[PDB]
Amino acid sequence: SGCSTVDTVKDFNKDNFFTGSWYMTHYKLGDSTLEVGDKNCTKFLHQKTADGKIKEVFSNYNPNAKTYSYDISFAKVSDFDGNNGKYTAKNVIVEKDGRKIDERTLQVSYIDTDYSKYSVVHVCDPAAPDYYMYAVQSRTENVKEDVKSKVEAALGKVGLKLSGLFDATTLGNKCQYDDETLQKLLKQSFPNYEK
């Protein structure tokens, strides 16, 4: 019980992964049937800087409530497990302006990625294992048709199929992403979490 350990991408290229932005297209969150409050449109921006810091800023938009939530993962190259797509991050839930609301530790496991199109991840809180997430992620709002099977294989490894996940792209026509806040918080200094 607790957080599941999943095999991860071998030879993780941080520099090509932690650049630009990603969209979360499909996902499973916990064991229970998904409620409308957990049906969100998520986009995140990240960056790895020379100092070795990794930073990821999430915009989570719930079309049903027309509300945004924001969180930021902070990690350092030295939090990664060797050369695998695996690491621990301090994830902070914040307001638009970056004020801390709550914080937790996440274990992030990249099951697979080709860097330029898609990634498949497992995220889990070692202190709240009932909060686990398996997610499909894309450089575009939809996963590009020509990698749909390369993705479905990855999900295969973890006992899942794409159709077995919430398709966030059913929200699409109502999906919104707070690019302004994303850009602003990425640049913004967080001395309580940097280092």
Side-chain angles (χ1 to χ4, degrees):
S1 301
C3 289
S4 297
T5 61
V6 310
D7 289 42
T8 52
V9 171
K10 203 199 56 163
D11 300 294
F12 197 55
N13 192 325
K14 307 194 194 75
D15 299 283
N16 295 124
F17 191 85
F18 296 109
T19 196
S21 69
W22 295 92
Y23 297 86
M24 292 177 72
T25 56
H26 307 73
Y27 63 86
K28 174 179 178 187
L29 177 74
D31 289 321
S32 273
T33 189
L34 205 62
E35 290 170 8
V36 67
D38 300 323
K39 296 185 172 179
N40 298 289
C41 305
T42 290
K43 177 175 184 188
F44 55 111
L45 276 184
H46 45 210
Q47 66 169 22
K48 181 175 89 70
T49 41
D51 59 5
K53 287 177 183 151
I54 284 75
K55 183 171 174 179
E56 330 191 53
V57 180
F58 300 79
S59 172
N60 310 307
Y61 177 78
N62 186 276
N64 179 74
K66 288 196 183 69
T67 45
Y68 282 98
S69 71
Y70 309 97
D71 63 280
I72 311 179
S73 287
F74 302 88
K76 297 176 66 166
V77 185
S78 65
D79 285 327
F80 282 66
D81 176 38
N83 201 23
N84 302 304
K86 181 178 172 53
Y87 65 107
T88 311
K90 164 56 110 292
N91 179 264
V92 183
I93 297 175
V94 298
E95 322 255 38
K96 260 186 65 174
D97 73 341
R99 246 175 312 146
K100 173 268 201 177
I101 296 182
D102 201 344
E103 58 190 80
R104 73 211 143 160
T105 305
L106 302 176
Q107 309 178 355
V108 186
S109 306
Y110 278 95
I111 296 147
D112 186 42
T113 190
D114 68 6
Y115 300 94
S116 53
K117 293 186 178 181
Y118 78 89
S119 50
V120 178
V121 76
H122 168 261
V123 181
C124 189
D125 186 343
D130 288 351
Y131 171 82
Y132 72 88
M133 183 176 282
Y134 284 102
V136 177
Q137 310 181 141
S138 177
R139 295 301 202 175
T140 48
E141 298 186 25
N142 309 266
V143 358
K144 196 178 183 299
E145 199 284 336
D146 60 35
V147 294
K148 294 213 71 69
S149 78
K150 205 165 306 182
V151 159
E152 197 128 23
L155 295 170
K157 170 202 132 44
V158 292
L160 293 172
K161 285 187 292 294
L162 194 55
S163 54
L165 301 187
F166 170 69
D167 182 351
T169 78
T170 54
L171 296 170
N173 32 326
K174 298 189 181 180
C175 280
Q176 293 287 327
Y177 308 98
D178 196 348
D179 296 294
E180 173 186 289
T181 303
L182 285 176
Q183 280 147 26
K184 179 195 69 174
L185 296 176
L186 185 76
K187 291 183 260 295
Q188 184 165 313
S189 168
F190 293 78
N192 301 342
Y193 306 113
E194 303 160 357
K195 300 173 302 296

